[PDB]
Coordinates of C-alpha atoms in Angstrom, one line a residue:
Chain A
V1 CA 0.0 0.0 0.0
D2 CA 0.8 3.7 0.0
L3 CA 0.7 6.3 2.8
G4 CA -2.6 7.9 3.6
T5 CA -3.9 11.2 2.3
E6 CA -3.8 12.6 5.8
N7 CA -0.1 11.8 6.1
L8 CA 0.8 12.9 2.6
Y9 CA -1.1 16.2 3.1
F10 CA 0.5 16.8 6.5
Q11 CA 4.0 16.0 5.2
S12 CA 3.7 18.6 2.3
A13 CA 1.2 21.5 2.8
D14 CA -1.0 23.8 4.9
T15 CA -1.4 24.5 8.7
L16 CA -0.2 21.9 11.2
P17 CA -2.3 20.2 13.9
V18 CA -1.0 19.9 17.4
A19 CA -2.3 18.5 20.6
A20 CA -2.2 20.0 24.1
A21 CA -2.3 18.2 27.4
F22 CA -2.8 19.7 30.9
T23 CA -1.7 17.2 33.4
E24 CA -2.3 18.1 37.1
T25 CA -1.4 16.5 40.4
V26 CA -3.3 17.0 43.7
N27 CA -1.3 16.7 47.0
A28 CA -3.4 16.9 50.1
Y29 CA -3.3 16.2 53.8
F30 CA -6.3 15.9 56.1
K31 CA -6.1 15.9 59.9
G32 CA -8.7 14.8 62.3
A33 CA -11.9 15.7 60.6
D34 CA -12.0 19.4 61.2
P35 CA -12.1 21.1 57.8
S36 CA -8.6 22.7 57.4
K37 CA -6.5 21.1 59.1
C38 CA -6.6 20.2 55.3
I39 CA -3.5 21.4 53.4
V40 CA -3.3 21.5 49.6
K41 CA -0.5 21.6 47.0
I42 CA -1.6 21.3 43.4
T43 CA 1.0 20.9 40.6
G44 CA 0.7 20.9 36.8
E45 CA 2.4 20.5 33.5
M46 CA 1.4 21.6 30.0
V47 CA 2.6 19.4 27.2
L48 CA 2.5 20.0 23.4
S49 CA 2.4 17.0 21.1
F50 CA 3.4 16.9 17.5
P51 CA 2.3 14.0 15.1
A52 CA 4.8 11.7 13.4
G53 CA 5.8 12.9 10.0
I54 CA 6.4 16.4 11.3
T55 CA 10.1 16.0 10.7
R56 CA 9.4 15.4 7.1
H57 CA 7.1 18.4 6.9
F58 CA 9.9 20.4 8.4
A59 CA 12.2 19.0 5.8
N60 CA 9.8 19.9 2.9
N61 CA 8.9 23.3 4.3
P62 CA 12.1 24.5 6.1
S63 CA 10.7 27.9 7.3
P64 CA 7.7 27.1 9.5
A65 CA 5.0 29.4 10.9
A66 CA 5.6 30.6 14.4
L67 CA 3.9 28.8 17.3
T68 CA 2.4 31.3 19.7
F69 CA -0.1 30.3 22.3
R70 CA -1.9 31.8 25.2
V71 CA -2.7 30.2 28.6
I72 CA -6.2 31.4 29.8
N73 CA -7.3 31.7 33.4
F74 CA -3.6 32.1 34.3
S75 CA -2.6 33.8 37.6
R76 CA -3.7 30.9 39.8
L77 CA -0.5 29.6 38.3
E78 CA 3.2 30.1 39.2
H79 CA 5.1 28.7 36.3
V80 CA 8.6 27.4 35.5
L81 CA 9.9 26.5 32.0
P82 CA 11.1 22.9 31.8
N83 CA 12.6 24.0 28.5
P84 CA 13.8 27.6 28.9
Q85 CA 15.3 27.3 25.5
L86 CA 12.5 26.9 23.0
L87 CA 9.9 28.8 25.1
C88 CA 9.4 32.4 26.3
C89 CA 6.9 35.0 27.6
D90 CA 6.6 38.7 28.4
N91 CA 7.7 38.6 32.1
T92 CA 6.4 42.0 32.8
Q93 CA 3.1 43.2 34.4
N94 CA 0.9 42.1 35.9
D95 CA -1.0 39.1 36.9
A96 CA -3.8 39.2 34.3
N97 CA -6.2 36.3 33.6
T98 CA -4.1 35.5 30.5
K99 CA -0.5 35.0 29.3
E100 CA 1.2 34.7 26.0
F101 CA 4.1 32.4 25.1
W102 CA 6.1 31.9 21.9
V103 CA 8.4 29.2 20.6
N104 CA 12.0 29.1 19.3
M105 CA 11.5 27.4 16.0
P106 CA 15.0 26.4 15.1
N107 CA 15.2 24.8 18.6
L108 CA 11.7 23.1 18.3
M109 CA 12.9 21.6 15.1
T110 CA 16.2 20.4 16.4
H111 CA 14.4 19.0 19.4
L112 CA 11.8 17.1 17.3
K113 CA 14.5 15.7 15.1
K114 CA 16.3 14.5 18.2
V115 CA 13.2 12.8 19.7
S116 CA 12.5 11.2 16.3
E117 CA 15.9 9.6 16.2
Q118 CA 15.3 8.3 19.7
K119 CA 11.7 7.0 19.2
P120 CA 11.1 6.5 15.5
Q121 CA 8.0 4.4 15.8
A122 CA 6.0 6.7 18.1
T123 CA 2.7 8.2 17.0
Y124 CA 3.2 11.5 18.9
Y125 CA 6.3 13.4 20.2
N126 CA 5.5 15.1 23.5
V127 CA 7.4 18.3 24.4
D128 CA 7.2 19.6 28.0
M129 CA 6.2 23.2 27.5
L130 CA 5.2 24.5 31.0
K131 CA 5.4 23.3 34.6
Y132 CA 3.3 25.1 37.1
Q133 CA 1.7 25.4 40.6
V134 CA -2.0 26.0 41.0
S135 CA -3.3 27.5 44.2
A136 CA -3.9 26.2 47.1
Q137 CA -6.9 26.8 49.4
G138 CA -8.6 24.4 51.8
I139 CA -10.9 21.5 51.7
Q140 CA -12.7 23.0 48.7
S141 CA -9.7 22.6 46.5
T142 CA -9.6 18.8 47.0
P143 CA -11.6 16.6 44.7
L144 CA -12.1 14.0 47.4
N145 CA -12.6 15.1 51.0
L146 CA -11.2 12.5 53.4
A147 CA -12.0 12.1 57.1
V148 CA -10.6 9.2 59.2
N149 CA -11.6 7.9 62.6
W150 CA -10.1 5.1 64.7
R151 CA -11.2 3.3 67.8
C152 CA -8.1 1.6 69.1
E153 CA -9.0 -1.0 71.8
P154 CA -6.5 -3.4 73.5
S155 CA -7.3 -6.3 71.2
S156 CA -9.5 -5.0 68.5
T157 CA -9.1 -2.0 66.1
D158 CA -12.0 -0.2 64.4
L159 CA -11.4 1.9 61.2
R160 CA -13.8 4.4 59.6
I161 CA -13.0 6.3 56.6
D162 CA -15.5 8.9 55.3
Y163 CA -15.1 10.3 51.8
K164 CA -16.8 13.1 50.1
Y165 CA -16.7 13.7 46.3
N166 CA -16.2 17.4 45.7
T167 CA -17.3 19.2 42.6
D168 CA -16.1 22.6 43.9
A169 CA -12.4 21.6 43.4
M170 CA -12.8 21.0 39.6
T171 CA -13.9 22.9 36.5
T172 CA -16.3 20.3 35.2
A173 CA -17.7 17.4 37.2
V174 CA -15.8 14.3 36.1
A175 CA -15.4 10.8 37.6
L176 CA -12.6 9.7 39.9
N177 CA -11.2 6.4 38.7
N178 CA -9.2 3.5 40.2
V179 CA -9.6 5.0 43.7
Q180 CA -7.4 3.2 46.1
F181 CA -7.4 3.4 49.9
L182 CA -4.4 2.0 51.7
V183 CA -3.9 2.0 55.4
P184 CA -1.3 0.3 57.6
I185 CA -2.6 -1.5 60.7
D186 CA 0.0 -2.3 63.4
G187 CA -0.7 -4.1 66.6
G188 CA -0.9 -7.8 66.2
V189 CA -3.6 -8.2 63.5
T190 CA -4.6 -11.8 63.4
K191 CA -7.9 -11.6 61.6
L192 CA -9.9 -9.1 59.6
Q193 CA -13.2 -9.8 61.4
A194 CA -15.4 -7.7 59.2
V195 CA -15.2 -5.1 56.4
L196 CA -17.5 -3.0 54.1
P197 CA -16.9 -2.7 51.3
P198 CA -14.9 -5.8 50.4
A199 CA -11.2 -5.3 50.7
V200 CA -7.9 -7.2 50.8
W201 CA -5.8 -7.7 53.8
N202 CA -2.1 -7.9 53.1
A203 CA -0.2 -10.2 55.6
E204 CA 3.3 -9.3 54.5
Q205 CA 3.0 -5.5 54.7
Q206 CA 0.3 -5.4 57.5
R207 CA -2.1 -3.1 55.7
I208 CA -5.6 -3.1 54.3
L209 CA -6.5 -2.0 50.8
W210 CA -9.8 -0.9 49.2
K211 CA -10.2 -0.5 45.5
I212 CA -13.2 1.5 44.3
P213 CA -13.3 1.7 40.5
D214 CA -15.2 5.0 40.1
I215 CA -16.4 7.8 42.4
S216 CA -18.8 10.4 41.0
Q217 CA -22.3 11.9 41.2
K218 CA -23.5 9.2 38.8
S219 CA -21.9 6.7 41.2
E220 CA -23.2 4.8 44.2
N221 CA -23.8 6.9 47.4
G222 CA -24.0 10.0 45.1
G223 CA -20.3 10.4 45.8
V224 CA -20.4 10.5 49.6
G225 CA -19.5 7.2 51.3
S226 CA -17.9 5.2 54.1
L227 CA -15.4 2.4 54.4
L228 CA -15.4 0.4 57.7
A229 CA -13.1 -2.3 59.0
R230 CA -12.7 -4.3 62.2
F231 CA -9.5 -6.1 63.2
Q232 CA -8.5 -8.6 65.9
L233 CA -5.0 -8.0 67.3
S234 CA -2.6 -10.4 69.0
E235 CA -0.5 -7.5 70.3
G236 CA -2.4 -4.3 70.7
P237 CA -3.3 -1.6 70.7
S238 CA -2.7 -0.3 67.2
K239 CA -1.0 3.1 66.6
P240 CA -3.1 4.8 63.9
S241 CA -1.2 5.4 60.7
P242 CA -2.0 7.8 57.9
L243 CA -4.3 6.7 55.1
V244 CA -2.9 7.0 51.6
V245 CA -5.4 7.5 48.7
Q246 CA -4.7 7.2 45.0
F247 CA -6.9 8.2 42.1
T248 CA -6.9 9.4 38.5
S249 CA -9.3 11.5 36.4
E250 CA -9.7 12.5 32.8
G251 CA -11.8 15.4 31.5
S252 CA -11.0 18.4 33.7
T253 CA -8.3 20.3 35.4
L254 CA -8.3 21.6 38.9
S255 CA -7.0 25.0 37.8
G256 CA -9.6 25.8 35.2
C257 CA -6.9 27.2 33.0
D258 CA -7.0 26.7 29.2
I259 CA -5.1 27.2 26.0
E260 CA -5.6 29.3 22.8
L261 CA -3.5 29.3 19.7
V262 CA -2.5 32.8 18.7
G263 CA -1.0 33.1 15.2
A264 CA -2.0 31.1 12.1
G265 CA -0.1 28.0 11.1
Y266 CA -1.4 25.8 13.8
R267 CA -4.6 24.2 15.1
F268 CA -5.6 22.1 18.0
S269 CA -6.6 18.6 17.1
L270 CA -7.2 17.8 20.8
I271 CA -6.9 19.5 24.2
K272 CA -6.6 16.8 26.9
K273 CA -7.1 17.7 30.6
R274 CA -6.5 15.3 33.4
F275 CA -5.6 15.2 37.1
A276 CA -4.5 12.5 39.6
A277 CA -3.7 12.3 43.3
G278 CA -0.1 12.6 44.3
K279 CA 0.5 12.4 48.1
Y280 CA -3.0 12.4 49.4
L281 CA -3.0 11.6 53.1
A282 CA -5.4 11.6 56.0
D283 CA -4.4 11.2 59.7
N284 CA -6.4 10.5 62.8
Chain B
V1 CA 3.2 53.0 -14.4
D2 CA 2.9 49.8 -12.3
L3 CA 4.8 48.7 -9.1
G4 CA 8.3 47.3 -9.6
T5 CA 9.1 43.6 -9.8
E6 CA 11.0 43.9 -6.5
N7 CA 7.9 45.2 -4.7
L8 CA 5.5 42.7 -6.4
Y9 CA 7.7 39.8 -5.5
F10 CA 8.3 41.0 -2.0
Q11 CA 4.6 41.6 -1.4
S12 CA 3.6 38.0 -2.6
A13 CA 6.4 35.3 -2.3
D14 CA 9.6 33.9 -0.8
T15 CA 12.0 34.9 2.1
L16 CA 12.0 38.4 3.4
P17 CA 14.9 40.9 3.5
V18 CA 15.5 42.9 6.7
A19 CA 18.1 45.4 7.8
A20 CA 20.1 45.5 11.0
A21 CA 21.7 48.6 12.6
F22 CA 24.0 48.7 15.5
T23 CA 24.1 52.2 16.9
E24 CA 26.6 52.9 19.7
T25 CA 27.3 55.9 21.8
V26 CA 30.7 56.7 23.6
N27 CA 30.7 58.7 26.8
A28 CA 34.1 59.6 28.1
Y29 CA 35.9 61.8 30.6
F30 CA 39.5 62.7 30.6
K31 CA 41.2 64.5 33.5
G32 CA 44.6 66.2 33.5
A33 CA 46.5 64.2 30.9
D34 CA 47.4 61.1 33.0
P35 CA 45.9 58.1 31.1
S36 CA 43.0 56.9 33.4
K37 CA 41.9 59.4 35.0
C38 CA 39.9 58.5 31.8
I39 CA 36.5 57.1 32.5
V40 CA 34.3 55.3 29.8
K41 CA 30.6 54.4 29.4
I42 CA 29.7 53.0 26.1
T43 CA 26.0 52.5 25.2
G44 CA 24.3 50.8 22.3
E45 CA 21.1 49.8 20.5
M46 CA 20.2 47.2 17.9
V47 CA 17.5 48.1 15.5
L48 CA 15.7 45.9 12.9
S49 CA 14.2 47.5 9.8
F50 CA 11.5 46.1 7.6
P51 CA 10.8 47.5 4.1
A52 CA 7.5 49.1 3.2
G53 CA 5.1 46.7 1.7
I54 CA 5.8 44.2 4.5
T55 CA 2.2 44.8 5.7
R56 CA 0.8 43.7 2.4
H57 CA 3.1 40.6 2.4
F58 CA 1.8 39.8 5.9
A59 CA -1.7 40.2 4.5
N60 CA -1.1 37.9 1.6
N61 CA 0.9 35.4 3.7
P62 CA -0.7 35.5 7.1
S63 CA 1.5 32.8 8.8
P64 CA 5.1 34.1 8.5
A65 CA 8.3 32.3 9.2
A66 CA 9.8 32.9 12.6
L67 CA 12.5 35.6 13.0
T68 CA 15.3 34.2 15.1
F69 CA 18.7 35.8 15.3
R70 CA 22.0 35.6 17.2
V71 CA 24.2 38.4 18.5
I72 CA 27.8 37.4 18.2
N73 CA 30.7 38.6 20.4
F74 CA 28.1 39.1 23.1
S75 CA 29.1 39.2 26.8
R76 CA 30.8 42.6 26.6
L77 CA 27.2 43.5 26.6
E78 CA 24.6 43.9 29.4
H79 CA 21.3 44.2 27.5
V80 CA 17.8 45.4 28.2
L81 CA 14.8 44.8 25.9
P82 CA 13.1 48.1 24.8
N83 CA 10.3 45.9 23.6
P84 CA 9.9 43.0 26.2
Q85 CA 6.9 42.0 24.3
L86 CA 8.0 40.8 20.8
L87 CA 11.5 39.7 21.8
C88 CA 13.0 37.0 24.1
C89 CA 16.1 35.0 24.9
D90 CA 17.3 32.0 26.9
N91 CA 18.2 33.9 30.2
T92 CA 20.2 30.9 31.6
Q93 CA 23.9 30.1 31.5
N94 CA 26.4 31.5 31.0
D95 CA 28.2 34.4 29.4
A96 CA 29.2 32.8 26.1
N97 CA 30.5 34.7 23.1
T98 CA 27.0 34.4 21.6
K99 CA 23.3 34.8 22.3
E100 CA 20.1 33.7 20.6
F101 CA 16.9 35.8 20.4
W102 CA 13.5 35.1 18.9
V103 CA 10.5 37.2 18.0
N104 CA 6.8 37.2 18.8
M105 CA 5.3 37.2 15.3
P106 CA 1.7 38.2 16.1
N107 CA 3.1 41.2 18.0
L108 CA 5.7 42.1 15.3
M109 CA 2.8 42.1 12.9
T110 CA 0.5 44.3 15.0
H111 CA 3.5 46.6 15.6
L112 CA 4.3 46.9 12.0
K113 CA 0.7 47.6 11.1
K114 CA 0.6 50.3 13.7
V115 CA 3.8 52.0 12.6
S116 CA 2.5 51.9 9.0
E117 CA -0.7 53.7 10.0
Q118 CA 1.4 56.3 11.7
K119 CA 4.0 56.8 8.9
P120 CA 2.6 55.5 5.6
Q121 CA 5.1 57.1 3.3
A122 CA 8.3 55.8 4.9
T123 CA 10.7 53.5 3.1
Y124 CA 11.6 51.5 6.3
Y125 CA 10.0 50.8 9.6
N126 CA 12.5 50.7 12.4
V127 CA 11.9 48.5 15.4
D128 CA 14.1 48.9 18.5
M129 CA 15.1 45.3 19.3
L130 CA 17.9 45.6 21.8
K131 CA 19.4 48.2 24.1
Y132 CA 22.8 47.5 25.6
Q133 CA 25.9 48.5 27.5
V134 CA 29.4 47.7 26.2
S135 CA 32.3 47.6 28.5
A136 CA 34.2 49.9 29.7
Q137 CA 37.9 50.0 30.2
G138 CA 40.3 53.0 30.0
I139 CA 41.8 55.3 27.5
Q140 CA 42.1 52.4 25.0
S141 CA 38.3 52.1 24.8
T142 CA 38.0 55.7 23.5
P143 CA 38.2 56.4 19.8
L144 CA 39.6 59.8 20.4
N145 CA 42.1 60.4 23.2
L146 CA 41.8 63.9 24.6
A147 CA 44.4 65.9 26.7
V148 CA 43.9 69.5 27.8
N149 CA 46.3 72.0 29.1
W150 CA 45.7 75.6 30.3
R151 CA 48.0 78.5 31.1
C152 CA 45.8 81.0 33.0
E153 CA 47.6 84.3 33.3
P154 CA 46.1 87.5 34.8
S155 CA 45.2 89.0 31.4
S156 CA 45.9 86.3 28.8
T157 CA 44.7 82.7 28.6
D158 CA 46.5 79.9 26.7
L159 CA 44.6 76.8 25.5
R160 CA 46.2 73.6 24.3
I161 CA 44.2 70.6 23.3
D162 CA 46.0 67.4 22.1
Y163 CA 44.0 64.7 20.4
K164 CA 44.9 61.2 19.5
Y165 CA 42.9 59.1 17.0
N166 CA 42.7 55.6 18.5
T167 CA 42.3 52.4 16.5
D168 CA 42.3 50.1 19.5
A169 CA 38.9 51.3 20.6
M170 CA 37.2 50.1 17.4
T171 CA 36.7 46.9 15.4
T172 CA 37.7 48.4 12.0
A173 CA 39.6 51.6 11.5
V174 CA 37.0 54.1 10.3
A175 CA 37.0 57.9 10.1
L176 CA 35.7 60.3 12.8
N177 CA 33.5 62.9 11.1
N178 CA 32.1 66.4 12.0
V179 CA 34.4 66.5 15.0
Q180 CA 33.6 69.5 17.1
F181 CA 35.6 71.0 20.0
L182 CA 33.8 73.4 22.2
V183 CA 35.3 75.1 25.3
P184 CA 34.0 77.9 27.4
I185 CA 36.4 80.7 28.3
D186 CA 35.5 82.9 31.2
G187 CA 37.6 85.9 32.5
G188 CA 37.0 89.0 30.4
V189 CA 37.9 87.8 26.9
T190 CA 38.2 90.8 24.7
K191 CA 40.1 89.4 21.8
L192 CA 41.1 86.0 20.3
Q193 CA 44.7 87.0 19.6
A194 CA 45.7 83.8 17.8
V195 CA 44.4 80.4 17.0
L196 CA 45.5 77.2 15.1
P197 CA 43.6 75.7 13.4
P198 CA 41.0 78.4 12.5
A199 CA 38.0 78.6 14.8
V200 CA 35.1 80.7 15.7
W201 CA 34.8 82.8 18.9
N202 CA 31.2 83.2 20.1
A203 CA 30.7 86.5 21.9
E204 CA 27.3 85.7 23.3
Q205 CA 28.1 82.4 25.0
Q206 CA 31.8 83.1 25.7
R207 CA 33.3 80.0 24.1
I208 CA 35.5 78.9 21.3
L209 CA 34.5 76.3 18.7
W210 CA 36.7 74.2 16.4
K211 CA 35.2 72.1 13.6
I212 CA 37.4 69.5 12.1
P213 CA 35.5 67.6 9.3
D214 CA 37.4 64.2 9.5
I215 CA 39.9 62.6 11.8
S216 CA 41.6 59.4 10.6
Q217 CA 44.9 57.7 9.6
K218 CA 44.2 58.9 6.1
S219 CA 43.8 62.3 7.6
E220 CA 46.2 65.1 8.3
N221 CA 48.6 64.6 11.2
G222 CA 48.0 60.9 10.8
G223 CA 45.3 61.3 13.5
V224 CA 47.4 62.9 16.1
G225 CA 47.1 66.6 16.4
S226 CA 46.9 69.9 18.4
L227 CA 44.5 72.8 18.8
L228 CA 46.0 76.0 20.3
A229 CA 44.4 79.3 21.2
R230 CA 45.4 82.6 22.9
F231 CA 43.0 85.0 24.5
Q232 CA 43.2 88.5 25.9
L233 CA 41.0 89.0 29.0
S234 CA 39.6 92.2 30.4
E235 CA 38.8 90.5 33.7
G236 CA 41.1 87.6 34.5
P237 CA 42.1 85.1 35.2
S238 CA 40.0 82.5 33.5
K239 CA 38.8 79.5 35.4
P240 CA 39.4 76.5 33.1
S241 CA 36.2 74.8 32.0
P242 CA 35.7 71.3 30.6
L243 CA 36.1 70.7 26.9
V244 CA 33.1 69.1 25.1
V245 CA 33.8 67.1 22.0
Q246 CA 31.3 65.7 19.5
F247 CA 31.7 63.3 16.6
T248 CA 30.0 60.6 14.5
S249 CA 31.3 57.6 12.7
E250 CA 29.9 55.1 10.2
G251 CA 31.4 51.7 9.4
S252 CA 32.3 50.1 12.8
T253 CA 31.1 49.4 16.3
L254 CA 33.1 49.9 19.4
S255 CA 31.9 46.5 20.8
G256 CA 32.8 44.3 17.9
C257 CA 29.6 42.4 18.3
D258 CA 27.6 41.3 15.2
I259 CA 24.4 39.6 14.1
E260 CA 23.5 36.3 12.4
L261 CA 20.1 35.2 11.2
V262 CA 19.2 31.7 12.5
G263 CA 16.1 30.2 10.8
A264 CA 15.2 30.4 7.2
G265 CA 12.6 32.9 6.0
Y266 CA 14.8 36.0 6.4
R267 CA 18.0 37.5 5.0
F268 CA 20.1 40.6 5.7
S269 CA 20.0 43.2 3.0
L270 CA 22.3 45.4 5.0
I271 CA 24.0 45.4 8.4
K272 CA 24.8 49.0 9.4
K273 CA 27.2 49.8 12.2
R274 CA 27.9 53.3 13.6
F275 CA 29.0 55.1 16.7
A276 CA 28.9 58.7 17.9
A277 CA 30.2 60.7 20.9
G278 CA 27.7 61.3 23.7
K279 CA 29.1 63.2 26.7
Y280 CA 32.8 63.4 25.9
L281 CA 34.6 65.7 28.2
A282 CA 38.1 66.6 29.1
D283 CA 39.1 68.7 32.1
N284 CA 42.3 70.5 33.1

């Protein structure tokens, strides 16, 4: 066969398609159950992706249009530049709801050639454009509000975890997926007498693990639920340990920030937005 | 008639021609005649010029190539950006003999449209790209070494100015043009008894002025010469005043720095280099 029309066209004409990705990370810490207490640190990265064949298009059209883009709903941010060569901005006043960035083309081209030598059979080359910090409030900046309670008796430990799905922390209500709840139980732990929902006790590491596939307002509970466990200890009592949660999402940012293309030459095939938990702890 | 072929071509095809100008200013102060003493402050600006019709070419080809250029023999410099929007650089390490800069095209285009509305019948639009400070040594950074001597008697003043053309302060030996030597004479001043070379006494401002058209190694003296004057004072004696020199040059910088185009899309029709005296004083 021959190459497609899409690939032929892209490798010798027009205005190029690129893809943008905003990938954010929530770090959170809850203490007791008192709202804040809660401490939040939200990180982010903005990645631009260029289709394979772009190195041929740059070899057939050696003087490319300039890539110029604009992050919208800025100012919550606090950016670095993972690649200070290849990317720049104004730097001056003030802290508007918008910021403009522009790309060093000869660099972008050398960079893409390099990545293509390293990974020839990839569909997309990702280039890290921005790194950033969103900000930073209380319990209302966290997608999933945690609250943990122990009852540590001399030979039995009782665990309650209450979780609250939180729309206020995201731009558009999207599901939380592959939610994991991990909590170490010391003491003796001989038996997991009872549990709800089902969970897995891990003998070797002495911790209990819950896997909830999706949390949302479409989901069971309506997003607000409980996990309960009861252990029998040989030693005792247990010293409470911090709960570690993990989750991922796709469809929204936590920042709300977005991206516009400025010049001509380029267009956005896709803008992907996702966030995941980083260090997401809750303590007694 | 119709437009030229140059203008037709330029307004609808190819790779654009631009012009670069490095314009420097020497500020100097000599004291007594002891070498340094001498104090030097050399300033500069780098200007990019775009031919008229460029706004039509941008209207017929809306996605232009990126302008990316590189100042060579940098590091003597110490730059600001007169237009922090439209221009950027790496900012990181270190202080190499070379630096790369790249332009915000949507801005450059809005800027050029604006200038064209303001001055439609101009041949070239100048855009201030860089401002800078060269550095900064002693008498060997000055194109024209000055040395002034007075003999202030009770009723007659004697002036000697010695000047030394200096190749060491410039990249390529070029002439100094429209050299003016202005020095105030207080006291009474009734008569300019004698003078060499010819000069003009100014009654109203009480100062003597010499105009030497060109100073060079092709020039008389070989570049090293004297101005002498003798005055008759009614009052007396004269308090010596600082000598003010003015000059201009075309053909060289004082820095030595230069400019390369990086991407494709653009080419240099002309790179013009010139320097002129700013505040260029010499004291007794």
